[PDB]
Design a protein around this ligand. Structure first.
Ligand SMILES: [Fe+3]
Length: 281
């Protein structure tokens, strides 16, 4: 058989999901590389050539990729497909992007089942010669995602309802927090060049003090300094780096979509746990 069906995605979470559905019969490549900021990414000549060479382009939609529309004007005769059809959007409530959908829908495992379904449909339509391989790989991979729900829930189970505050830098965890009963606090609603972050840093400092929230987090594609400022001024621990916008590289700590969900939930649970330094009181 000749060269495989080539799929190009806008960022790495879609790439890894799509690659599991594709298995060995298609090659899935990501426009943005691990670690790169994906909201205001600036496409390069490599990105255009890679997209022009694909047989299918997958993107998130929900205004995640602010660059995609201009980028896509420069690609001729490549079909695109949004992978979030059927997602129920949560709105951004503050800032210059109030009213636009919060696009980080993949942070909910049960939304991943909708991503998988939409990717599977797109692949079967545009490469029907391998339809049965996509359908079987999509089914098998949905079962892996469904098996995550019960252990993720167990991992968070000793944080009582009123202590479940998720304090992060980007408000990128709203779909995860909704599924698992967390109240979200963020330093900015969504990545962008924007006013109001120093103000919000001080608003969040007050919320942590009033509710005795023990931990705050940052994310892997943005600067950890505002979160460290919050930790310094409140006494809350800096709980480390959460992954939402990007996987790591293939040899780093978060190589797959499932690992991103597990590491993020585990890092959250470790931030609330009492297993630090201990004395005999
Ligand atoms: Fe984001």
């Amino acid at each position: 058989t000749a060269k495989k069906f080539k799929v190009v995605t806008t960022f790495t979470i879609i790439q890894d999901i799509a690659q599991n559905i594709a298995g060995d019969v298609a090659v899935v490549e990501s426009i943005t590389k691990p670690g790169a900021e994906i909201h205001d990414y600036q496409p390069t000549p490599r990105d255009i050539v890679k997209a022009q060479s694909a047989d299918l382009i997958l993107w998130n939609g929900m205004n995640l990729e602010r660059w995609f529309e201009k980028f896509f004007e420069s690609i001729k005769d490549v079909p695109s497909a949004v992978v979030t059809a059927g997602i129920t959007p949560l709105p951004i409530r503050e800032g210059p992007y109030s009213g636009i959908a919060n696009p980080h829908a993949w942070m909910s495992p049960s939304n991943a089942l909708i991503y998988i379904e939409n990717i599977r449909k797109a692949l079967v339509e545009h490469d029907p010669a391998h339809a049965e391989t996509y359908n079987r790989n999509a089914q098998a991979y949905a079962e892996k995602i469904k098996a995550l729900d019960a252990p993720l829930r167990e991992r968070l189970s000793r944080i009582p309802a009123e202590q479940r505050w998720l304090v992060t830098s980007e408000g990128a965890f709203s779909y995860l927090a909704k599924d698992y009963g967390f109240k979200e606090v963020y330093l900015w609603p969504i990545n962008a060049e924007q006013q109001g972050i120093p103000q919000q840093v001080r608003h969040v400092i007050d919320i942590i003090r009033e509710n005795k929230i023990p931990v705050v987090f940052s994310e892997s594609t943005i600067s950890d300094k505002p979160a460290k400022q919050v930790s310094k001024e409140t006494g809350a621990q800096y709980g480390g780096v959460l992954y939402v916008d990007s996987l790591s590289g293939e040899k780093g700590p978060v190589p797959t979509y499932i690992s991103l969900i597990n590491m993020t939930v585990d890092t959250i649970a470790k931030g609330f746990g009492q297993l630090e330094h201990h004395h005999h009181h």
